[PDB]
Amino acid sequence: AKDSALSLSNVAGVFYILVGGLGLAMMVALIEFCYKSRAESKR
Amino acid sequence: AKSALSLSNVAGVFYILVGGLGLAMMVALIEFCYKSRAESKR
Amino acid sequence: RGVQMLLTTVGAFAAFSLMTIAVGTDYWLYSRGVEVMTHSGLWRTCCLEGNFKGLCKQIDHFEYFLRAVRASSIFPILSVILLFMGGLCIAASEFYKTRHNIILSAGIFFVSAGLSNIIGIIVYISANAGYSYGWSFYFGALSFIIAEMVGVLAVHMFIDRHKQLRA
Amino acid sequence: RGVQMLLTTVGAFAAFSLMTIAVGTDYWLYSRGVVMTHSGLWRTCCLEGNFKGLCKQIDHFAEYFLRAVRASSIFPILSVILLFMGGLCIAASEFYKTRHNIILSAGIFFVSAGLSNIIGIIVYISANAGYSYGWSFYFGALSFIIAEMVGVLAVHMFIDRHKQLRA
Amino acid sequence: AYIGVSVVLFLVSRFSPYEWHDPPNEFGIFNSLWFSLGAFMQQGCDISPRSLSGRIVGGVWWFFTLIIISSYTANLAAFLTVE
Amino acid sequence: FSLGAFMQQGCDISPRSLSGRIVGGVWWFFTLIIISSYTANLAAFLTVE
Amino acid sequence: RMVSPIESAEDLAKQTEIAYGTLDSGSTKEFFRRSKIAVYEKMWSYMKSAEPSVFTKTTADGVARVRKSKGKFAFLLESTMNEYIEQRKPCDTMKVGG
Amino acid sequence: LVREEVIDFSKPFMSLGISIMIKKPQKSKPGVFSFLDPLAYEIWMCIVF
């Protein structure tokens, strides 16, 4: 007649977002550090 | 001829939030006006 | 300092123009109606193809209160009006440079405009419940974002003026 | 300081070796296939039956992007490359003891290698989903953990060097 | 992900010497691990990052925690209802 | 501190030592699991009669 | 809750992601070629100019194509045969619409 | 009609027609960002606003 444990694939996107945010934070911190380093060198 | 939760299910809370923001601005501005009037008359 | 006035004026003009275009244009929603693919705005729905391509028809808007608010489009128009008043306050602040309360007023208007925008959107989508979104919808959203940013700028400028006056 | 450098070098070498072995070996997963086989990133080899010991290249071919990223194994190899670069930076730090940004570069390389290891693990598991895990998978995981610890050590060494310069 | 988040938070909070100029903040490796654990458990009251990068890390960790915990509760409810 | 942690109501103070932090973290995990189980079983009760 | 993409003839007519085909030579082919109803007009136009050809040699080939296409192919055939196949192993096909 | 012009047919003992056969819908592999599914896209956009 016509009459479960969710896996990593169900939540892979949030892992990707988290790792992307970690990379973005690293990039922002490094950019600020480089800018301050050049400013210090000039001064 | 012939799943997801829609915004219509939670529109009231958005209305409440925006009303509360307006009320907060109103209260802050009323206090500012009162204090400024007090300052002018002194 | 003058850079802040320039940014505030440019953002105010951008937000006002975006909101006016979004209210005036008809590319808010892409759907199927009169059957045929159509694009509809706040007032008119037009056919994107078929034998009636290019023809437009007034939307028939008739809870009663929700229908009335959606039909009148009171909140998008109020947002446009508030953006206009904020721009007027910014312009007037040039002539009256010692009246700081003008700048504050401008900020308030912009913030208020943004809030009005939100409500409009919430109404619009809700009224559709009882497809895709065109570039007028996103023009309105961008207008909201720019209005909030310009309001933040104007409030910052009021604060800076009063801090300079305090010293 | 000497103890810290020794630990950093040993940990960098350990992480690099573990990741290289995990990428090169073929014991990432145990599963039924062509009948009980062990497979790595590249090959599947039968561990029982008449064809025991016979290896076959894995037939890898939104969904297309995931399948391509899994087939290329870009992220595990990128992790190996980043670990190698961090090791090179650590080695070069000795020759140039006044350039303190080499330690920072090594720490950044190790942290980035750990992050790419995480991404590679997630991609591998997700691609497989579309059994049991062997010793090379856990070699990769241990490499990730050691890489993160060594990155912390390198950042601590950079901080200590700059504190000594300040005082 | 917990290990990676803690390490990256420590790195972005403490590496730069132009902020040390006592530590600039309370986010060492141990305090970063504590912050991440409390964030995942949704319990921390102790300290939050003040820099832009530390706040980016904290925000993405918070989003991850929210989604994961909601998923755990929802799937447990599904298990119990189905049984 | 333990009561506030279980009720998920923040905290005035948090432990700063390794051992105090072990105790706090394990208590937090216990609280998370128990509260989630309570909510899930209540939902199961209310869904199926 | 699993929802089928197709629920009627007009649903097939509107979309293009899912292809559909009939027997190369059979009553269905002539029915679609000779039809005079706008929906079947557009179906016939799509089917005749479909690259690669959507028609099949025999009904078994069409059923196999439906089964192996992962839901990207729909076979138009007699309702009785459709019902019969729907009730046979591996039980992976079903009849939609009227 | 062509057959009816040479033989005699009884009334239809079984009526049929042309119908559409499709593979039975099955569980789809979850999308990468399927964790946003519980709420509509408009809800997320309005949450950001």
Numbering used by the authors:
A (entry chain D): 779 to 781, 789 to 828
B (entry chain C): 779 to 780, 789 to 828
C (entry chain Y): 6 to 39, 56 to 83, 95 to 162, 174 to 210
D (entry chain Z): 6 to 39, 57 to 83, 94 to 162, 174 to 210
E (entry chain A): 534 to 554, 570 to 631
F (entry chain B): 583 to 631
G (entry chain D): 632 to 729
H (entry chain D): 485 to 533
Sentences from the paper on this structure:
GluA3, a subtype strongly associated with disease, functions as both a fast-transmitting Ca2+-permeable AMPAR at sensory synapses, and as a Ca2+-impermeable receptor at cortical synapses. Here we present cryo-electron microscopy structures of the Ca2+-permeable GluA3 homomer, which substantially diverges from other AMPARs. The GluA3 extracellular domain tiers (N-terminal domain (NTD) and ligand-binding domain (LBD)) are closely coupled throughout gating states, creating interfaces that impact signalling and contain human disease-associated mutations. Central to this architecture is a stacking interaction between two arginine residues (Arg163) in the NTD dimer interface, trapping a unique NTD dimer conformation that enables close contacts with the LBD.
GluA3-G–TARP-γ2 determined in the apo state diverges from existing AMPAR structures in its sequence-diverse NTD tier. We constructed a double-upright GluA3-G–TARP-γ2 receptor to a resolution of 2.5–3 Å. We also observed selective interaction of the extracellular TARP β1 loop with the B/D LBDs, while the other TARP pair targets the A/C KGK motif40 through their β4 loop. These contacts are conserved in apo and active GluA3.
